[PDB]
Design a protein around this ligand. Sequence first.
Ligand SMILES: [Ca+2]
Lengths: 178, 107, 48, 685, 83, 290, 48
Amino acid sequence: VLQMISACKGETGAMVSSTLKLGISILNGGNAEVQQKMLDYLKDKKEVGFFQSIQALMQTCSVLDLNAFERQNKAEGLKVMADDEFTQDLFRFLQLLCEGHNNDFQNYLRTQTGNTTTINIIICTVDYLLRLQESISDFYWYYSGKDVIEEQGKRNFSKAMSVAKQVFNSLTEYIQGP
Amino acid sequence: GVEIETISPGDGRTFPKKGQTCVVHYTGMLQNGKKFDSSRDRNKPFKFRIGKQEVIKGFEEGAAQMSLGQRAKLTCTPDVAYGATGHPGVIPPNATLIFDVELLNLE
Amino acid sequence: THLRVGWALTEGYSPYPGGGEGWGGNGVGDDLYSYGFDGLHLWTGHVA
Amino acid sequence: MDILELSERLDLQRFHSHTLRLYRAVCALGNNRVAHALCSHVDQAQLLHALEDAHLPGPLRAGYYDLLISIHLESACRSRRSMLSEYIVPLTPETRAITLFPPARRHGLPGVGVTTSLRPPHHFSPPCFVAALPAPARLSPAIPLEALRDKALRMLGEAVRDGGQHARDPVGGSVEFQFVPVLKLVSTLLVMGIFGDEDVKQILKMIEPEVFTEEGLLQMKLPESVKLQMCNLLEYFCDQELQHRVESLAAFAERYVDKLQANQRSRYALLMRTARRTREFRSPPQEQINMLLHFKDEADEEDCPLPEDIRQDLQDFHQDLLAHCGIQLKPQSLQELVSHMVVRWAQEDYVQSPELVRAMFSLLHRQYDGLGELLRALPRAYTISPSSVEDTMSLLECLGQIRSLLIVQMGPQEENLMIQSIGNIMNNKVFYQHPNLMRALGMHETVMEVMVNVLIRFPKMVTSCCRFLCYFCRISRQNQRSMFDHLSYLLENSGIGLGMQGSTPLDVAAASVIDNNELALALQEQDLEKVVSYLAGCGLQSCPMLLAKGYPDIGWNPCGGERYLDFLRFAVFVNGESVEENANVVVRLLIRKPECFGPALRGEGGSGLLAAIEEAIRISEDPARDGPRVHLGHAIMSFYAALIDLLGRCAPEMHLIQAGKGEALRIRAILRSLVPLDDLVGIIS
Amino acid sequence: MTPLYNLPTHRACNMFLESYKAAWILTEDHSFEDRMIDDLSKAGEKKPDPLHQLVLHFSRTALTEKSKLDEDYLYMAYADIMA
Amino acid sequence: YGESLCFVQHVASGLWLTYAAPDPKALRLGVLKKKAILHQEGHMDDALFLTRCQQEESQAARMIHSTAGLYNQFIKGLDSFSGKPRGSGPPAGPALPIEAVILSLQDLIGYFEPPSEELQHEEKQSKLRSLRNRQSLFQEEGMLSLVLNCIDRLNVYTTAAHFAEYAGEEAAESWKEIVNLLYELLASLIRGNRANCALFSTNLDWVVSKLDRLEASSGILEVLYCVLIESPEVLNIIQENHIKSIISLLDKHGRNHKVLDVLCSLCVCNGVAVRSNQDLITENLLPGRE
Amino acid sequence: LVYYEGGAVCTHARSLWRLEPLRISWSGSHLRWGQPLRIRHVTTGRYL
Ligand SMILES: [Ca+2]
């Protein structure tokens, strides 16, 4: 799983999606042996592709967009967040690494010692959260004046809130222990 | 301008006529004795018709002078077979061809 | 088919089955020790 | 000397083996003229003798087998294989007689029985080196096929029979050299469809006598190469089983549709002697058939107007189809045999060849998952009335011919062949009557692949391809969307090299979005900024082509400007109406780069439009300023006209102005500020 | 809006195939993953067992030095099965 | 590293390091390069980051420096006596650094050799990445041009005696050895790298014209084989005279299977065939039968 | 001359530099703010 994620080189597709699904499935329930094996392998190889690919994947994630929504409404008169499940899977995978109060992985995610360069994942997570928050604020500003809401607005609100709820859980997992 | 030499005698009475098809078994080779074609390897006689320009002039003129069942040898000059172009990958330019033709049946 | 007749010398005329001069299948008159005839040519030294 | 003496002269052996490799290389990938030429250097008798010979060294044995295959069979096998993933089933009496099982029951033998899917025949010509020389393409050299297949079967049988003697002098010096060549030959012959029912029965018998009956190969000890060949052999029978399933399904579909139509006729006739029951007959046929099949579960058995016997018939067919795919509802079937063999091979030893591993696991996955393959293959299935068989076959020939040229560097002969084939295709009625079938074969993807491969160096190839693609788009909206999918890919190419004389990729890109509100709305904004960036260059540097021809140099190239402006116009205006979103985006992008407006509107030091056009008119008088087939004044006057037309089309509608929209008013004010009224009046006058 | 009983036979057949695939084929359920992993995890008669060999093969393909990762359906199918 | 922002100042003058304002003329021309200068105030964006570099790149840089110096010295020494026959007396110029050049070439050849075909797959993949990186590093600084110039200057002599007529018999014993080592090093630099191979698409005559030289024939053949088997760009440039020169090689040097391999490489590359090459080879090789 | 550039030159040898503190002893000491030192170009061996 780690090798495939490193090989993807931060390009979205079906391969990385299936790899993340397999990782989630094998890592459920905070399995300690899997966490230990992954950490040992990562520290042994000292390769920087893994975190570079993860950073690129996070930067490629999508958020709400009003222009697409208006275009779709115009067209139906005669998508937006089309890859939410991929984002949820990515952040769930990141969460499952630290579950169980694993101090070693919690520290490793912030700084890599032996590696030539280092990448901080907490900063990336907060950046994505900020982008999502701005999108939600724009949506509410658009909808404030009118009173009622149709089906599409409710669906978009529900899915954006689900993604936000996953990101908050991941941030909580990064901290506890403490 | 074609030289013809006899190898075996034929009937001496039947000759090719307009509107007929000649069936022959032939073996071709260059002037240096390097074989390049032979219908007997494929075990299938070759059929051609006179006047429709299906084969080189040398072959047609050589066959027109042969009797049924006769075996003879033919020699064709470069200007009568392929000229200065030749057959790419088979015959080089300006090559003299020698044939061993036997007439089997006429129809 | 191949068929020839003629004379040959006690020394030198030693045809071995298989390959030899030019393309194999050598008979009577394919070297400078034998002299053959086959109805149309005189063979000697592998030349007709 | 005897060729068998090469078993002790190693240097000559190596040189001759490499000579055979060179022969096999100079005729690779469909070069039939060289294949014809090579027949004078290696004739039939030599090849057959080498095939039979038992004292030949291994390398030469393999070289001669490969040489025979390359000269005589490679092209036909490739062509046949390219068309083996599609199923065009004609409706004929023999089609109606196909059933999943013989009179759920015991499985039939794979590969035997009648098939009806269309596959074009093979073409060969006899070699001859006395025919008079005279540009039609050449066919492959011919060779008798029944005798060859009999020879191959006899040789394989002899090898299998003698394998049990565990002798110390195998043919070729090893088991691999004894077995691999004949297996390659038999596989090539089998894929081409040369064998009959009895021959395939013999092959199956000698693969595993116990399973296929009404010591085999699998029960022997083999190296990796023989195992790879066996995998290649088994793939063929798996494919045959899949094809049989598809054909049976099509036959049942026809038989069922007949009864459904009859029943609907009777019901409608009866109805004329609640009102909700009349909604069936005022809905599109797709919805009717969709609702007629909603009785899979008893809970969904309320809205079906049908009787019980018809539902029982469909249920019986469905159960039989499930049984055929191995879904339960001393192996005695192909699936069990394959699974056991693969698992046993895997757990007997640690295999080293990656190709063998991939083959084994692909086979295993195909076996375990039965109907996934049927689901993936159904999209490429189609039915045809018997009257269209000739036209369909003619179209398939040309399509295969085009596909063949996807693996060769372009040349004049290839250009002519493609032009001729496209011309032939566009004149067929099936190209119009069955657009879905054409879209299912992916012809447009092949055409674009060929177009890009040469992307000028071939100006006649691009024009024809562009014309064909535009015509394809014009047929229907589904084709329009299909080509719209590749809009970004099309735009990346033809960004500096116009090849202006004839239709280019930008033309098909424009044609892919004409008069379609949905597609225009779905247009991405990344395609808009890239085109504007391309335009910006045209306003800075002259065209090198004109300079090469001696034209005077000026700091811009109007031709590309007008081309891109035409594309933008087609993008912004649809059927007499302006889409405001793209209008706002494009006007914003344009104002962001004032240099795109051309020298007149540059601003600082920029003269007005009237002065520029007057200067162009005066230029048109002087040959020195107009040239050393194209003129400069007209080009300038066309560029400015296109720009003004685009800007005019970008303006908003009047009903929006009545609502007092801020954006509409801002846009109108900007446009009004850009062009003075008196300038327009002067131009018109 | 024409009645279904007036269309040509072949068009009706194509529509029927589409509908049957949409409604009756993919709705079917069939679980084989557990059995397929159980079968692959056994051994006869230490060298790797078949599942280990499959995983090693995919690792080998991943580790090869290349500019881009090619998409292959076999890996996706087997990853889905294992998951 | 990567966190401490820093400003650079000149101690004597106190000026700060910053970048000059962009030039519209240069910007319109596409000159991204921004000249750097020292200014009294500069701007607020003059901070710089510090990034670590591996040991291999530093070692390669030092080797580049040393070898460039040595080979420039050698080239100048060779040019010293370009057209000055020594007659019966001493040769011209200071002596040549023969031993240093030989040792340097031997060291570099062993620095580029490829991984063993008996290593485990993953360690071998690691071996191939580092080698490609080092080849690119060396190529980017102009070492290929340097070795090409050296070969060109040495190639103007037909034999060892003709060389000794100018450089003296004392240094003519290493002529053939140096030529062979240079060809071997060029082959090592080119092997297995698409980008480096693609460079030869403009001067293929430079390679083909040397195939008939009696010294280092095998090295030149190896260079040609390495170039042909990698770059599809060259395959579209071949002409009939090149084919005839190669076929000239088999009727002049004897029956060698390497030439047949080279010819096989001219027909199909990466599953794409070139009809012109196949036709030319068939026309010029088969019909004679000698 | 000296320039600012981006792209592939970030991975090339012509963008690397070595720090040479003026003092010879303990030249490997941790760098500290305000320290005077020289700058060298590795490939060309010239000093800024
Ligand atoms: Ca927790």
